[PDB]
Every structure is written in structure tokens, then in C-alpha cells.
Amino acid sequence: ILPGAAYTEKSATYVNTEGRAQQTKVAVTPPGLAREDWKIIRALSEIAGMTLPYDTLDQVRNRLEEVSPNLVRYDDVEGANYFQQASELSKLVNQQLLADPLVPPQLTIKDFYMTDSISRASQTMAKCVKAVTE
Amino acid sequence: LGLREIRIHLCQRSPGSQGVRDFIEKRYVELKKANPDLPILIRECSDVQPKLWARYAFGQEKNVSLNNFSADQVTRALENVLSSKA
Amino acid sequence: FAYDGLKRQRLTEPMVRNEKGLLTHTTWEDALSRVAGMLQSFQGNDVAAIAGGLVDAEALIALKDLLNRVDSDTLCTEEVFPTAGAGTDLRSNYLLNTTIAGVEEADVVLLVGTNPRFEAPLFNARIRKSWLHNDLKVALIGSPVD
Amino acid sequence: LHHAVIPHGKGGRSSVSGIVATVFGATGFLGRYVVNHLGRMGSQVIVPHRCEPYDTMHLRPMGDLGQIIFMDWNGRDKDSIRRAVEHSSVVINLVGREWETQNFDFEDVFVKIPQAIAQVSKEAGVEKFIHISHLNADIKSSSKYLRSKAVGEKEVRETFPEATIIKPAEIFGREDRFLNYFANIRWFGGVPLISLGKKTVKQPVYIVDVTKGIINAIKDPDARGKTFAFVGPSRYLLFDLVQYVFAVAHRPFLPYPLPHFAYRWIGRLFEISPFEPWTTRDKVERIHTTDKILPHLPGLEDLGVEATPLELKAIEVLRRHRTYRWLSSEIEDVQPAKTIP
Amino acid sequence: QLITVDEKLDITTITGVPEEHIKTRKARIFVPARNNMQSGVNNTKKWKMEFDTRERWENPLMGWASTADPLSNLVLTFSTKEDAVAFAEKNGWSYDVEERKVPKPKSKSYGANFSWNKRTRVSTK
Amino acid sequence: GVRTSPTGEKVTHTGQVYDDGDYRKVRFVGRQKEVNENFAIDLIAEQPVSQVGSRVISCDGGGGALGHPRVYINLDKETKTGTCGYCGLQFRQQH
Amino acid sequence: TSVKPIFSRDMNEAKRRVRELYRAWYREVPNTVHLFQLDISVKQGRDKVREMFKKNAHITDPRVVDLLVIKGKMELEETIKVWKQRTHVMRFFHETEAPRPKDFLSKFYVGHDP
Amino acid sequence: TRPTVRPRNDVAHKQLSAFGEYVAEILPKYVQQVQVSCFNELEICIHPDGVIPVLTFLRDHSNAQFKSLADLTAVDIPTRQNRFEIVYNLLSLRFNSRIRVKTYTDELTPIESSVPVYKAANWYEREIWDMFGVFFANHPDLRRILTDYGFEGHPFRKDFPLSGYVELRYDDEVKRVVAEPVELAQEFRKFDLNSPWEAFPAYRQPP
Numbered sequence A: 001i002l003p004g005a006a007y008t009e010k011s012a013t014y015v016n017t018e019g020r021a022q023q024t025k026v027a028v029t030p031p032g033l034a035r036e037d038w039k040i041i042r043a044l045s046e047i048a049g050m051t052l053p054y055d056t057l058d059q060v061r062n063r064l065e066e067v068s069p070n071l072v073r074y075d076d077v078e079g080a081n082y083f084q085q086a087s088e089l090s091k092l093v094n095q096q097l098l099a100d101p102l103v104p105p106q107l108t109i110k111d112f113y114m115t116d117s118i119s120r121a122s123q124t125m126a127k128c129v130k131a132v133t134e
Numbered sequence B: 001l002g003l004r005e006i007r008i009h010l011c012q013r014s015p016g017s018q019g020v021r022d023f024i025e026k027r028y029v030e031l032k033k034a035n036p037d038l039p040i041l042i043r044e045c046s047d048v049q050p051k052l053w054a055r056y057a058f059g060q061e062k063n064v065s066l067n068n069f070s071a072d073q074v075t076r077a078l079e080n081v082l083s084s085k086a
Numbered sequence C: 001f002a003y004d005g006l007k008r009q010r011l012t013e014p015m016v017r018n019e020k021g022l023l024t025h026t027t028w029e030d031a032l033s034r035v036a037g038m039l040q041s042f043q044g045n046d047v048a049a050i051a052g053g054l055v056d057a058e059a060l061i062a063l064k065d066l067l068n069r070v071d072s073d074t075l076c077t078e079e080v081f082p083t084a085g086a087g088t089d090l091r092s093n094y095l096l097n098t099t100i101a102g103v104e105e106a107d108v109v110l111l112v113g114t115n116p117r118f119e120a121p122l123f124n125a126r127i128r129k130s131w132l133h134n135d136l137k138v139a140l141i142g143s144p145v146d
Numbered sequence D: 001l002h003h004a005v006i007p008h009g010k011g012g013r014s015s016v017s018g019i020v021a022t023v024f025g026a027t028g029f030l031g032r033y034v035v036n037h038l039g040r041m042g043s044q045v046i047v048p049h050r051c052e053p054y055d056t057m058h059l060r061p062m063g064d065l066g067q068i069i070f071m072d073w074n075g076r077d078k079d080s081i082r083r084a085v086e087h088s089s090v091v092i093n094l095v096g097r098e099w100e101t102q103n104f105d106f107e108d109v110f111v112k113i114p115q116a117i118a119q120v121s122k123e124a125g126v127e128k129f130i131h132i133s134h135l136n137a138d139i140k141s142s143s144k145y146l147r148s149k150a151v152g153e154k155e156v157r158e159t160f161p162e163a164t165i166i167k168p169a170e171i172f173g174r175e176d177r178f179l180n181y182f183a184n185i186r187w188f189g190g191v192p193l194i195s196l197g198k199k200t201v202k203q204p205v206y207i208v209d210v211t212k213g214i215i216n217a218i219k220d221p222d223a224r225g226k227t228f229a230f231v232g233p234s235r236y237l238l239f240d241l242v243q244y245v246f247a248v249a250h251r252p253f254l255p256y257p258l259p260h261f262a263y264r265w266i267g268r269l270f271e272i273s274p275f276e277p278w279t280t281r282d283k284v285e286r287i288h289t290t291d292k293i294l295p296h297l298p299g300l301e302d303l304g305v306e307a308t309p310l311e312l313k314a315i316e317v318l319r320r321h322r323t324y325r326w327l328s329s330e331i332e333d334v335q336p337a338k339t340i341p
Numbered sequence E: 001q002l003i004t005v006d007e008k009l010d011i012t013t014i015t016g017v018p019e020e021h022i023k024t025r026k027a028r029i030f031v032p033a034r035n036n037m038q039s040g041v042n043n044t045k046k047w048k049m050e051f052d053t054r055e056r057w058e059n060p061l062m063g064w065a066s067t068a069d070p071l072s073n074l075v076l077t078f079s080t081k082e083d084a085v086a087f088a089e090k091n092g093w094s095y096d097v098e099e100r101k102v103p104k105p106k107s108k109s110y111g112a113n114f115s116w117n118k119r120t121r122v123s124t125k
Numbered sequence F: 001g002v003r004t005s006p007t008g009e010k011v012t013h014t015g016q017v018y019d020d021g022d023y024r025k026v027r028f029v030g031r032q033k034e035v036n037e038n039f040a041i042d043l044i045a046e047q048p049v050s051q052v053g054s055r056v057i058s059c060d061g062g063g064g065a066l067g068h069p070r071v072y073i074n075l076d077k078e079t080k081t082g083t084c085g086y087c088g089l090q091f092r093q094q095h
Numbered sequence G: 001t002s003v004k005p006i007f008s009r010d011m012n013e014a015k016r017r018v019r020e021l022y023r024a025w026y027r028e029v030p031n032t033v034h035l036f037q038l039d040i041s042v043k044q045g046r047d048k049v050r051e052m053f054k055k056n057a058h059i060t061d062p063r064v065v066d067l068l069v070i071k072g073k074m075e076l077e078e079t080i081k082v083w084k085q086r087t088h089v090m091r092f093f094h095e096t097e098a099p100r101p102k103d104f105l106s107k108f109y110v111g112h113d114p
Numbered sequence H: 001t002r003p004t005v006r007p008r009n010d011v012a013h014k015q016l017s018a019f020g021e022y023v024a025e026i027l028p029k030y031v032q033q034v035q036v037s038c039f040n041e042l043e044i045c046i047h048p049d050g051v052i053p054v055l056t057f058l059r060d061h062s063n064a065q066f067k068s069l070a071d072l073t074a075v076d077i078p079t080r081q082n083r084f085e086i087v088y089n090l091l092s093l094r095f096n097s098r099i100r101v102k103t104y105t106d107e108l109t110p111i112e113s114s115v116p117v118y119k120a121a122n123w124y125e126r127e128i129w130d131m132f133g134v135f136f137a138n139h140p141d142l143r144r145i146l147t148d149y150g151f152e153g154h155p156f157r158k159d160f161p162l163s164g165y166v167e168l169r170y171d172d173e174v175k176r177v178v179a180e181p182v183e184l185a186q187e188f189r190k191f192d193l194n195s196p197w198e199a200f201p202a203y204r205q206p207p
């Protein structure tokens, strides 16, 4: 088990459903011996004699730009095109639609409160589930 | 030492990426049909120089500038990657 | 209100399995060395990784680069997306291309197999805003959720 | 790790080193440097003291608020030892005396007390134990001091098998009884030496080197159960060393030969003092004992410390032994001593 | 008599800052978001420059929040984004600039509450 | 009331107590842990509920301007008592 | 880019003032060690002086150089007149600061500071 | 004369306004702005080249006679390209009047020393150099005055941290006081005090 940082404890990049990249900021530091997540992997790569070529947060974000240049365009919504090509390729292989009706995982409010590891450990979220089921 | 992944960066509106835009429009569908299991990641971003990235085994990457290439030149840059593996 | 989960069940120290098979606190030096030793002894499809829901992009690319350097390409996510056809080759295949603010300009919305109220509460709030103010017509294929 | 001992900060005065250390014998030459280095990085230091609280005051500025804790103890009261070690993660034993007293002989301070501290520490779950012995410890030694060190070092390794045992040569520093001892022979005119100091070799080590070696032993997992020998970088003839001491201090050097039986007789003369004897028979023996060569033991370099030459620090100890005429003389004015290659 | 100096302004060597706190810091240039607990907008007028948050730990004696970051409380105020960027450049700090967020102009109408045939009709006042 | 932990250390009115294994309790060896004995949570419970004949009562803690700011307390719910938010005194509406 | 100078019209004149300051410091180290009764050698003192000049070798603005020289002369005067005490002279050698390793792994083990 | 409101004095306001433009008429080469506050204090804002001509005129002119330099100080405004405002407060005993003269400079531009005009300015300029790092040309003896020997930085700049960068303690090993990076047992707690509601409409800046 390698203890990493939560989203409140690191400056990290997330892309929302629009494709808009945004970055968190460090509010507090990770607890105990926990460490920034990308540093753990960079540290491991050196111990295994496979050192990744970036020592700072700025450099690893340069590496992000080399893989998908939109991941460093913070707060910008970058248009994506070629829906025609995607539809053309989506016809090549036919697959069957099942008879199962489309049922979402969350059907009422009680299913809304505990979905991730943080919310599952929240005592407040447990109060909300208890409130809407008793 | 084979080919693992191809990435194509381009701008949606710059004239320098026009050839890359044409290639995707006309030849990407056929290119993907010949390499079903080859990830060919197209990533558009405003005002970037078009580039072709190729990742080989054990994380070796090389990139080729596609700035002002015509659609025919893009097909060669990709043909060299898909064949002259390394 | 979920931030109080950040003060509970936290992982604060590296852990390894002891000789009875139970997790015990150890140093960063010891923990990484046991991981590095295994990483140095496996190649290709013998090494895989799974990224969870709250993982940042910096860790994602760092993990990908580390696994690629042992010639592994099994970098997976838990959340499925069909790979048939364009797969993830084209961003438009897996994006909300109309954008959230665009909901306010739509005149029809078709929701297929989703419960935006709980999946994206603020996105659903945006739909109700357009339903209220632009007389948006909304139709849903799926279960009749509220 | 218990949450309260996870290191935090940048290794400064207000940081948290994670070290909770009981330092027995912290009120002496080696104690003040060890406590200084622990408090520098925000360790919790427990200082059990036998002395009058006035004599511990110099330790108070060494740690942030609440980080130095003082307790009373008695080397024969095993309960008082338990109170001082039951909360610590490491225990350091620096207890020792260069002369026997009416109440405590070399066996008490070098065998009984070190054994009792190690025993209580083991029973109390103390995880680390650092014990200072002596480089020249030997059951065959002609010095009771060195014979008791050999016995005490054996008993410590049995009570606390995982102990780190450190064996320093003669340690030189500002408050040492080494360079200061030679410089203080000047009040008797000539400098007596057994065989004119040509039969003895010493390899003295700087105080800060020993201190840094102790601190690294605490943090080094490999140091558990080992025995180290802390020696300086150079071996000198006792005659050349004392000649260098008088040159650095710019005092006239008048060595003369004194046979062993004669030196012993004067040693007893100074043992009459009920206070702190200027010299003793045992002290004369240890100064003229050759510093053992122990290639099989690890040393300071094994703990990361780079031994400090005596040539760079002698002035720091010996400048105060000069007269006004020579006070301002610089370090390079005196030529070094012949080092036994 | 004036002289010509065409190089960029770099005062990092005559400000006396330790090198660690020049090259390892990350200044954020932004206009503070409105506190959502209040409607007043007077605290969203000026540009601010702050630095990256660093470790705080509990003081063993009291439990107080200790820090070793000298810049933990440093916040500067600037009239414009250009002023803040220029200050960051000459002092050698890398920085991120966040564009000002201005509330969208809204179309408000009391009459819509009583619409004959629209959904904006309110059921209560 | 002030309890003691299984280690014997007294528990404060805020529930503080060094746990079994916390080194920081060495600061109390040879000295003592200062602990106020009069727990205000228990003292305020000792007070009796005051019966009033109006829907709304006011409290200022007593002593006039030596008390706390004057507040008004609603006594319409019969399932519970109105509590002063400053001093904790309790009120109830008689029948 | 027309700015009022401090002393030097251009870098050529500024580097002349730099060399003059270096000579003054270089000659002064032997007296500083002797007067302050420091336990370091003249070689260490002059190496430290050299290290202080070197950290600023990358400057190209004459005005910045002039201010560095002005401060250097102020520092030298404080030393020559024994306005400084031994503690001030020795603060250049940071004798009590523990080593802070400057490689990624070492920092990773100790904390979050980059 | 409402009891809680400070009363106005228009006679002083008028007199100071007239003298303000009198100074602007006589020294147009250097005067950039003249203003009188609502509590009757006159300020002359000048080009820095005019420090000596302007201060000499106010000291020696028969209709000015500002013989006393009450105060000389600086203010740091990081948002300005010339961040340092230099402020001279002068007193005229003959006319029982005060005047403020203000100029500006940046980190790298020297200001002419006013010691020739006012011997009082000597230590004030040393303090400004010490606390702000503004260099004064032709000062007979410019050096730190308030900070510790060898102190690095200029504490009164807005970007100098409140607690600085180093702190002192006594170290037994080296037997002297040493300087080490600052660590605080309790960090200073920054308070955000400003109300989000405007207080003074009369001073509202245009949007």
C-alpha cells in the first residue's frame, strides 16, 4: 500500500465531461507519510532503474502536453470534430442490443450519497442515507 | 521493438494543419480498418503545430512535424512509421 | 458535505505484508524497493494497472510511462467505454461536445440510459434551467426517474 | 508509526524528528553535543540527571518549548530508570567517570549502571539502545577503567542483543579531558611522559564526529546490533601529539622521561583530592595505552560521518590556553605533527 | 545623462530572497472569487498574487499549526493582470494567471412570474 | 464527570486523553495533568426547568447587563423545552 | 529603454568596479581571520569570497551590478570596522545547517517540498 | 456644527490651494500634480529630477521658508511600475504651515540625496535605503541603520514576509549565535477582514 494524496492535497489536473481541463490547488498537505501521487511513481521509476524524465510538476505537465496538448489548456473547452468518421467506423461491426431495459445505477436519492471512496467514508453522507431510508 | 501507438496533434482551424485535416477526413477511416488494434489518437487543440507521435516498445517515442504538409505528405509520414518500425 | 470523508480511513504510511500475511507499517524506502524488485522481474502483459475514479492526469501519465518502460500497455480504467470503431481515437466519440452551457441553446434534448439528476446534478440543474426559461422539450429513453 | 512520531517539518528547531530519546549522562562532555544535535531537529529528549539543576541549565536552550524534559534519577534505583525510558523509542547511555569515588567505582558506572539501564530498557519495549564503550576496552588492560569497559560492553550485548555499541578513541573537543589535559600540564613546568611518549600511539577523534555518528546510528536500521569503532583520520605518537598541543598553544615544551612506577606514584598523589582529581593512576595508564587497530569493526565512514582531522580543530580547543601575546595566532602558523603512515 | 539597457528586468539577486523561495515557488495571479455566503462584490475588484501552500504540522507542545514556509501569508494586490505579471517576472517567480470571471448579464423580469402560458409562472410568492 | 483512561490518565471535559502509546504523556511524569473538575455540561443539566405562562420568554442570563445579550425563546413545541442558546437555561410552557 | 544610471554607463565600466571590490575583499580576508580570531584558514575565507561573486556572474544589467557592488562595499566596510561580530562573519558558512540532499528521491523521503 | 463630525476649515483650504498653484507656476519644469485634501493638507507631486530644485525653493524662498524637514519616508506600491513613493513632510515656522512633496522611483533608479538642503535628511535616507532599498546618490554615508549587520533584504517592501527568512538562536556546539531558516511553532494566522460591501461611495473608482 502506497499512501497518496487526495484531491484537496495536490495540484492535479482533471478533465470534466466536456473535455475541459482544470487543476486543483493544494489546500492542505497529505497526511502522515502520504505523498503526491505522480511523485510516488516517479520515485519508483528511479528505484527500478527506469527513471521517468520529469522531476517537477511543471515538467510532468509538459509530458501531458506531449500526449494530448489540450490537457494543459486550463479552463478552455477544446472543440473535437470528425463525428462523420466515428459514425462510419461504428457501422463496420454490428452488435446485438440486449433485451434488458436501460436501468440507471442510481434510481433514488439514497443511491446518490455514497458512490466513491471519499463519500463512502463520510459520516455525513451516512447520515443522509439513514435519513432518506428510515 | 514494434510500434505501439500513434498520436496526431493538429489545430482545428490553422492553415498549417489543413493537410492533416484532409488526411483525417479522407484516409483515417481506411487507415483504422487496416490497423484495428493500433491506437491512433487524434487530438485537436487550438493553435498547435501539427505533429505525428509514434511510441515503440519500452516507451521509446519519436515525433515528426507535419506543419504545412499536404494530405499526400501526411500519408507518407504515417507510412514510414507503420513500416520503418524501430 | 463529503469532505468529512477526508478525515477517516486515510492511508498514512506505506504498508507491506509481513511473514504472517498481515499488512504492517514500513518505510518508503522498503516499500518502493519491494515494488521495484517485482517490476524489474516482469515484462509485457505480466504487468497491468487500473486507474480509479478520483485519479489525476499527472499520476495517469506517470503510471502509463512507467508501465510502458517494461513494455506493458495494459493501462486500464474501471469505467467502461466501447472501443469498437473509432474507440478513443477521436475525442468527439467520448465527449459532451455540445458543452454544458450549450444546453441553454438546445430546443430538444434526448436523454438515453442516464439519470443526470444523480450522475451530474449540476448538469441536470442546467437542463431544468432551459426547461424553465427556454421551454426546452426533454425526452428520456430509460427508467422513469424523477 | 504512531501518529505522534511521524516526522514533520524541515528538520529545524520547531520540526518533529520523530525521535523520542532518553539520554543518560547528558550533563557531561559528550552529553551536551548529543542533546544539542537531537534538539536541533525537533526531537523529544528526556534528560535524567543526578546533578543539581543549576548544572543542567546549559541544556535548556537546546530544544524548542517542551522538547527537553528533565527527571531525577539514581543509578541504583531501577524504578527511576523505568520512569525515564518507558516513553522513549531510543535510549542512549553516556554515563561514565574517569575516576572512582567513595560511592561509585569503575564497576558501578561501567558495568552495573549500564546493565541496569539496558535491562529496564529491554523490559520496557525500548526498540533502540546506543551504548558507548571505549576503543581500548580490554579484559587484560592494566587500567581498571578499560577492564570494566570490556566487561560492561559484554553485559550490554547480552541484556540488549540489538544494541548499538560505539567504541570511540580519545575524544578531543572544547570541554575534553584530552587536549585540555595536556595543555594543563604546563603548570608543572616540564611534561612527564612514560618512555618519552615514543612507545604510544593515539588516534583521537573529534567530538562532533562522535556526535554525528551517534545520531546516524539512531536513524540507520543497519546499525542495530552492530559494534562500531570511532577513530580519527590520523595516528600520532604520543610525543608528537603533545608536542603539537604545546605548539598550538605556544607554550614552552620541556618533555622529560618518567618511568612507569614513578608516574604511578604521582598518580596516587593526585587521587587524594576529594574533588575532581587532576590526574590519577588509571588516567596515566589510558593516556599511554596504544589505540587499538580494529579493521574488522565498522567505523565512522560506515555511518556517513567523515572524520575531522585534529589539525583543523586543535586551535578551537587550545586557543584559550595561550597568553595574550599569542592569542591572535592563526591556524596555519603551527606546522602539523608527524602522522604514522 | 541617460543610458540604454535593453535586457529584461531581473531583480532576483538584489532582493535578498533565498534561492529556494524564488525558483521552487508558484505564484497564482487571480481575482478572488466572490464569497458565496454573501452577495457583496466589493472583494472581486482587484487582482491578487499568492503562493503555493506548503506543509503545516501540529506543534507537539500545544497542537498549534506550525509552518516553515516564510511566504505562507504573503498576498499582494494589483490593479490589473498586467501589473501582477510584470511584478512576478522581475522577481523571478513562475506563475499561473487565471482570467477574470465576470457574472453573466441576466435578463430579469418581474412580469414573467405571472405568465399566461409559460413555465416561468411561479406557484408562490 | 472526569473519568480515567485504562492507563489512569484523566479525561478532560473536551474528551482529551493521550492514548496508550502516545509518547507525549511523558510531560506529566513527575508532574500532573491540569484538569478542571467542574464539568459545565453536567452542571447545567442540574438546573431545573422553569415553568412559564407565555408562549415566548426572554433570557439574559441573570444579573442584567452582567449576563448575556437578551434573547427570546419560543415555547410552542410541547415535545421539548426551550433552551437559552447562551446560558443553557431551560424553559417550558405550563399547560 | 533610456534609464538613469547608478554609477556604470555599461557593463564594461561595471565589471571594473566588480574587480576592484574583489581585490578589496581578497586583501581583507587575512585581516578578518586574524582580527575575529576565526578558526578557518585564509584559503577558506577567500574561497567563500569567490563563491559569493560567482553566484552573481550571470548578471548583464549594469544597474544591477552597481547595486551588488554597493552592497558589497557596505558589507566590506562593516567587516573592516568590526561593526560585524564573529557571529556575522561566520553566517556565510552556515556551519549548523544540516545537509539537505538535492536529488528527487531524497526530497521524496523527507516531505512534500519540491 | 454637528457634534460628531469634524468641522471644515475653508479658509485654510483656500490658502493652501492658492499656494499650491503658486508653486506650480514657479516650478513648471518639475511639478506634475498639486492637490489639497479635505482635511487641509497640501501635496506637491513632482518629477524625481526636481527633488533638489523643489526642496531648495521651499526652504529658501521668502514666501515659503520651509526650514524644517519634519519627516522623510517611503511607501511601497507594488502595482506601480515605479513602486516606491518618496514623501517629504516639511514645516514652515514663519507661516505656521506644512507641505508634503512626493516623488517616485523604482528598484534600480537613484534619487538625489537631499542632505544638502536638510541635514536632517541624512538618517531618513539611510532608513529608506535600509527598509526599502532605494539608493540615494551623493549621500555622504549610505548604509543600513535599523536592520541587523549583514541582513539581507528590505523588510518594508510589501513582498518581504512579516517574519522574514531567517531567525537566530544560541548554538552550544559553535559557541555563538547562529542564523537558520525561519520556522514558527505557531504560524501567523492571516485574517480576511474586508467586508464585501462598499463603504465609501465618494471614492468609487470608475469601472
Ligand SMILES: NC(=O)C1=CN([C@@H]2O[C@H](COP(=O)(O)OP(=O)(O)OC[C@H]3O[C@@H](n4cnc5c(N)ncnc54)[C@H](OP(=O)(O)O)[C@@H]3O)[C@@H](O)[C@H]2O)C=CC1
Pocket: D024, D025, D026, D027, D028, D029, D030, D031, D049, D050, D051, D074, D075, D093, D094, D095, D096, D097, D098, D104, D109, D132, D133, D134, D135, D167, D168, D169, D170, D171, D172, D177, D178
Ligand atoms: N575521551 C572521552 O571523553 C571518551 C569517553 N567515552 C565514554 O563516553 C561516555 C561519556 O563521555 P564523557 O561525557 O566525556 O564523560 P563525562 O564524565 O564528561 O560525563 C559523564 C556523565 O556521566 C554521568 N555520571 C557519572 N557518574 C555517574 C553516576 N555515578 N551516576 C549517574 N550519572 C553519572 C555524569 O553526570 P554528573 O554530571 O552528574 O557527573 C555525566 O553526565 C562515558 O561512558 C565515557 O567512558 C568513551 C571514549 C572516550
Ligand SMILES: [Zn+2]
Pocket: F059, F060, F061, F062, F068, F084, F085, F086, F087, F088, F089
Ligand atoms: Zn440565557
